[PDB]
């Protein structure tokens, strides 16, 4: 059997017991709120990870690219939301997916994008399902939640244009700037209220709006109530990461994704251990640098997964990571503690960024064996 | 003409590719290749390009055709790929892990002249014991710390150099040389500081080789390099080869260091405008950090380019517009100066294609399964590159 001692390094390891606990926690919270969970698979892009989310009770998926829609559809998943403002040039790709049987949903936030979809759908005989993206927190895309004229103009373009106006959605991504339950709870309420208000405005205009979809992992876990909401979209929670830990929604011990690395040398005067997990393994994401505890390029754990507080990757080049004390001191006799060849596991800043560096995950079972779970790269 | 007509009908250009896409401007890439090879020829040293920037067979083929001698790789997966493609002279320039010794042995047994590096007595002892067990005289170079960038034996640490060189030589391995990488050059931004660092890198690696040879140990190769010190060195006496890699494409970190212009940057990411926030002066593009990478190396340099410098479809810089933010599949295009551009939707209409110059070519390239190699006629060809280990 393949195990953490036999793998080459670096490797992206999923602790299956931790991932299942994360999947159960999120599904149980959504069940308590009376809403569907539509996981965002862009975090893993791996068929077996999404299958475990579905087995726990998830309803459909959210994807960040049409490549992910192709992969998951080829795997038998048909209820797919492509939650990135639709580019008109990708309409042939989307059409071919729907004609093949994939119930692929698109989103827009502009009259011009809604007109491009509706005109192509009429030409091709396709009533595209399209949701309107709502900006509830100023994070990124979307129709402002009280910009009613814009909301109604896009709504009538789709519905009068013969398309299926399927719903409204929002992602309150500014939740990643927060770090207290009170602030997260308030942002989750602003997200819920803004999305519900857009749905209510459509409906008062006699336009259909059957789905109201909100979510980010921190607002999904913090929201006190979700009246008016039909589903929540959350993705990074499947593994968690150190950014989530700093936001306050999980502990380091809950993070299910780590990078297995080998010690390949040392700088004794500086108290460095050099590992073979550089930024090509961890990614360049440094999201914890802007937070109350900086973890460098990741938190060190031993081969058993025990967190080693106070050792982090303080630097990284492409294929070399620099392990050193978080307090800045030069650990004495670093080589005596971490001899050449010692294996360690590094928890990521951002699970979605680190996962994308690997062709595959190594799914670690209770007995210590691993199975390789491929994931998708590119577009 | 059946093949001809069908190929024409299938041929992509920058208007027909899906976005995002990593586009190599071949004419800029050839100018970078010629420039570095001519500089190394002028210095009388070999150029051993570091292929970890592209990990692409046709890009390394163009470096070889121009005059390069061998390659440097950052992983044994690169050594496996490039050897399969016919490159036999390969330096694996990352401190050797003992557990990878079976793979290095297999590659040498298949005919790859694969060189390994160490910087410790324990790594030397592991290589020599495995080589004696397996009947293999591994070739091993000793890595030298000349500028404090990362790791390596100190150039002035004679006792440790000798201990490692003797462990290898007495152990029946081939002690083949010393190498250094003065990566602290990426913190510099004047020709004077770069020329002085290049001289410190040359002097320190030659110093180490001279200490080994003074002890009777072989050390025929002296290998130095980073792209900025390769381009800045006045003299390379005592050096046998230079390793450089990011030069093949350049990037905005190199532009800021001062060793190229933005117009020399051969790699760009083709993106489409997919939305706006008109009141904030934002255009939203489909190149987020999954396309650009999270690399922000320009953040602390003289000119911060955010997640990349915006260029028009013809690849010309659009001054003052950069990607100021990025989420996974969304980039935020806005003024670098922090003004909200008026009429952003007029400046950048929905569906507009743009090209984004990267902070760090090695980091952006690794986000793509393949490059789109752009010829002067506007045609592109898919050039696969390696992902993972
Ligand atoms: C449109 C949309 N919906 C849901 C999610 C899931 O959010 P998480 O559960 O918090 O992962 C996202 C996530 N988007 C990413 C991104 O990079 O775009 C986050 O904003 C982030 O990691 O910063 C989403 O876009
Ligand atoms: C051992 C070794 N040799 C040569 C090079 C090539 O340097 P460039 O020509 O400047 O790319 C490198 C490069 N190493 C990278 C890295 O990430 O490790 C650079 O230090 C960097 O991009 O920061 C090298 O490691
Ligand atoms: Mg975000
Ligand atoms: Mg994320
Ligand atoms: Mg460096
Ligand atoms: Mg580089
Ligand atoms: Mg392998």
Swiss-Prot record, chain B:
Activity modulation notes: Strongly inhibited by hydroxylamine. Modestly inhibited by EDTA.
Cofactor(s) needed: pyridoxal 5'-phosphate; Mn(2+); Co(2+); Ni(2+)
Gene3D superfamilies in the cross-refs: Alanine racemase, D-serine dehydratase-like domain
N6-(pyridoxal phosphate)lysine modified-residue sites: 52
Entry keyword Manganese: yes
EC number annotated for this UniProt entry: 4.3.1.27
Entry's pH dependence statement: Optimum pH is 8.5.
Entry-linked SUPFAM superfamilies: PLP-binding barrel (SSF51419)
InterPro entries: Ala_racemase_N (IPR001608), D-amino_acid_metab_enzyme (IPR051466), D-ser_dehydrat-like_dom (IPR026956), D-ser_dehydrat-like_sf (IPR042208), PLP-binding_barrel (IPR029066)
Domain of life: Bacteria
Cofactor note (record): Divalent metal ions, such as manganese, cobalt and nickel.
Reaction(s) the record says it catalyses: (3R)-3-hydroxy-D-aspartate = oxaloacetate + NH4(+)
Thermal properties: Optimum temperature is 50 degrees Celsius.
Subunit structure, as described in the record: Monomer.
Family: Belongs to the DSD1 family.
Annotated function: Catalyzes the deamination of D-threo-3-hydroxyaspartate (D-THA). Also exhibits dehydratase activity towards L-threo-3-hydroxyaspartate (L-THA), L-erythro-3-hydroxyaspartate (L-EHA) and D-serine.
Protein name listed in UniProt: D-threo-3-hydroxyaspartate dehydratase
Annotated organism of origin: Delftia sp. (strain HT23)
Gene name of this polypeptide: dthadh
């Amino acid at each position: 059997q393949d195990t953490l001692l036999t793998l080459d390094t670096p490797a992206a390891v999923i602790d299956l017991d931790r991932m299942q606990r994360n999947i159960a926690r999120m599904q149980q919270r959504m069940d308590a709120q009376g809403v569907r969970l539509r996981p965002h698979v862009k975090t893993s892009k791996s068929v077996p990870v999404a299958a475990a989310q579905r087995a726990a009770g998830a309803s459909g998926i959210t994807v960040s690219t049409l490549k992910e829609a192709e992969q998951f559809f080829a795997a038998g998943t048909t209820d797919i939301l492509y939650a990135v403002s639709m580019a008109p040039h990708r309409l042939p790709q989307a059409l071919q997916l729907r004609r093949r049987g994939c119930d692929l949903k698109l989103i827009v936030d502009s009259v011009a994008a809604a007109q491009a979809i509706a005109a192509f759908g009429r030409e091709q005989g396709e009533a595209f399902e399209v949701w309107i993206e709502i900006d509830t927190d100023g994070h990124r895309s979307g129709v402002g939640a009280d910009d009613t004229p814009l909301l109604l103009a896009i709504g009538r373009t789709l519905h009068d244009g013969g398309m299926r106006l399927g719903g409204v959605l929002t992602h309150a991504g500014s939740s990643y700037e927060l770090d207290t339950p009170e602030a997260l709870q308030a942002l989750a309420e602003r997200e819920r209220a803004g999305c519900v208000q857009a749905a209510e405005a459509l409906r008062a205009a006699g336009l259909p709006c059957p789905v109201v979809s909100v979510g980010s992992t921190p607002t999904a876990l913090a929201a006190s109530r979700l009246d008016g909401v039909t589903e929540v979209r959350a993705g990074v929670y499947v593994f968690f990461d150190l950014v989530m830990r700093n936001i306050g929604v999980c502990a380091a011990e809950d993070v299910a994704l780590s990078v297995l690395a080998t010690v390949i040398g040392h700088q004794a005067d500086k108290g460095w251990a050099i590992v073979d997990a550089g930024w090509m393994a961890m990614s360049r994401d440094r999201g914890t640098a802007r937070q109350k505890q900086d973890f460098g390029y990741g938190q060190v754990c031993d081969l058993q997964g025990r967190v080693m507080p106070g050792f982090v990757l303080t630097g990284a080049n492409q294929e070399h990571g620099i392990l050193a004390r978080a307090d800045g001191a030069a650990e004495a006799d670093i080589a005596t503690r971490f001899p050449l060849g010692t294996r360690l596991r590094i928890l990521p800043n951002h699970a979605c960024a680190t996962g994308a560096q690997f062709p595959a995950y190594q799914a670690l079972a209770a007995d210590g064996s691993v199975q390789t779970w491929e994931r998708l790269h590119g577009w």
